[PDB]
Amino acid sequence: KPRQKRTATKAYNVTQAFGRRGPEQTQGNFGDQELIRQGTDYKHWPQIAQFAPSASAFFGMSRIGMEVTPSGTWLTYTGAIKLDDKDPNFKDQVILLNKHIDAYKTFP
Amino acid sequence: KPRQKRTATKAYNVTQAFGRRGPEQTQGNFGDQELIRQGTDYKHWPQIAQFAPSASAFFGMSRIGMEVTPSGTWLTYTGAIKLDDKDPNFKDQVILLNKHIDAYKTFP
Numbered sequence: 001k002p003r004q005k006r007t008a009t010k011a012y013n014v015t016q017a018f019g020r021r022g023p024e025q026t027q028g029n030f031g032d033q034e035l036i037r038q039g040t041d042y043k044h045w046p047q048i049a050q051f052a053p054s055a056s057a058f059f060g061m062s063r064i065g066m067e068v069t070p071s072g073t074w075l076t077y078t079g080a081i082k083l084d085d086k087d088p089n090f091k092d093q094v095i096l097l098n099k100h101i102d103a104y105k106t107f108p
Numbered sequence: 109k110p111r112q113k114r115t116a117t118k119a120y121n122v123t124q125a126f127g128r129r130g131p132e133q134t135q136g137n138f139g140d141q142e143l144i145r146q147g148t149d150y151k152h153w154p155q156i157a158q159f160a161p162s163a164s165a166f167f168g169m170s171r172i173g174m175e176v177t178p179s180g181t182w183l184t185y186t187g188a189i190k191l192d193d194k195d196p197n198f199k200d201q202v203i204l205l206n207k208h209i210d211a212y213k214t215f216p
């Protein structure tokens with residue numbers, strides 16, 4: 001199964017599917033120990049998943065590039081998704097996301 | 109519907125759902141005039157969607173950020189998806205992506 005279509009679970013976790021969290025430019029940086037171990041089996045996965053784009057919105061919203069390099073041909077992307085700072089749930093949404101962003105720094 | 113969960117189609121097209129294509133960091137750059145007007149109705153949409161990330165992959169592969177600002181809050185994302193050059197339609201995939209990346213610059 002191609003990487004971008006994979007689904008992390010406890011049986012095939014975030015490290016297994018998507019590699020060690022870390023600081024380098026195309027290394028993923030999201031997930032505390034719990035989410036890394038659990039993937040989509042994490043009990044608050046739906047709270048995170050609400051921010052993930054549809055395929056339509058991924059190619060609609062993103063800045064897309066294509067790079068040909070010694071490692072192969074890559075589809076590059078950047079973008080931003082705006083939260084609803086008016087939502088009463090907003091504060092708890094930020095905390096949850098901040099909890100996973102760069103969490104790897106605090107453990108081996 | 110939240111922007112990231114929208115699905116463009118001929119009845120609700122890329123521009124209506126995700127704004128004009130353009131050079132700005134908040135705009136998208138992807139799609140020629142056929143893709144913009146048809147969205148997921150686009151004849152080659154399946155061949156573009158194959159490179160769009162699953163919710164697990166979006167959070168597993170991407171460099172994720174949170175910009176909490178007095179004027180609004182955004183989940184940031186960047187990354188790279190390698191193409192499969194062993195795929196029989198690799199060359200067609202490269203030609204397809206080339207037709208849409210930044211196509212807006214030519215529009216009459």
Ligand SMILES: CC1(C)S[C@@H]2[C@H](NC(=O)[C@H](N)c3ccccc3)C(=O)N2[C@H]1C(=O)O
Pocket residue numbers: 151152200
């Ligand atoms: C003449 C071609 C452009 S169509 C044919 C096929 N490539 C395809 O696009 C394929 N059948 C197809 C997939 C999806 C939608 C529509 C068509 C192939 O190979 N050919 C090209 C060529 O080499 O010149």
